[model samples]
Target chain A: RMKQLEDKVEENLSKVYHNENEVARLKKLVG
Target chain B: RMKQLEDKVEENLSKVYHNENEVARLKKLVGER
Candidate 1:
């Protein structure tokens, strides 16, 4: 399931980007 | 670079798992996810 894995990778990267933003927002709040 | 991207995919998923845990911990501290 390379394709499936590949897909997960794509999704995961996207999720990471999203989390980056989330973390940034949280950091601002916590600061 | 499918192979390159494939490798990234693996790394990215692992990172996501790491981030999930990080987010969980952050949520405990921040009171949100």
Candidate 2:
């Protein structure tokens, strides 16, 4: 289920970025 | 699972780093000073 988990994480991360510019901003700041 | 996944990704990324003759490619790419 690694692929499933990865997909889920990717989906959620994508959603977080899509739903809020804050996520992208913070990611750019921290990443 | 997480460790294995990280290892695999690191291995592949290492190949990219080594073959590309880049200096600490991922680290520098992601964390440029």
Candidate 3:
């Protein structure tokens, strides 16, 4: 279970990074 | 297993929202130039 949790966290962190980049890109267009 | 996936996705979404908010807050402070 711990191993599974670590894998999921890694994947989720990537998704979070993608979302952060998308937000930054859009904000840049507006600014 | 699907239920577990749903729960984890929901939790991860909240984490993502927090990070986005943090980035936006910091960006706001820098854009005044």
* Clash tally, candidates in order: 0, 0, 0
Candidate 3 DockQ, CA atoms: 0.17
Q: What digit string (tens of lDDT, one per residue) describes model 2 on residues B1-33?
A: 787875765565455445444333433555647
| Per-residue lDDT over A1-31 for candidate 3, one digit per residue giving the tens place of the 0 to 100 score | 6566667778778878787786777678667
lDDT scores of the candidates, listed in order: 0.79, 0.54, 0.74
Each model's chain A TM-score: 0.65, 0.57, 0.83
Residue pairs clashing in model 2 are none
The digit string of per-residue lDDT tens for model 3 on B1-33 reads 756876876698788878877777766766664
Q: Mind giving the per-residue lDDT tens digits that candidate 1 earns over B1-33?
A: 667877877776887888878986886798654
Report how far residue A21 has shifted in candidate 1, in Å: 1.8
TM-score of each: 0.62, 0.32, 0.51
DockQ, prediction 1: 0.55
Best by DockQ: 1
Model 2 over residues A1-31: C-alpha lDDT tens digits?
A: 6786577556555544443564344457566
**Segments in model 1 whose C-alpha atoms lie over 4 Å from true places:** A1-6, B1-8
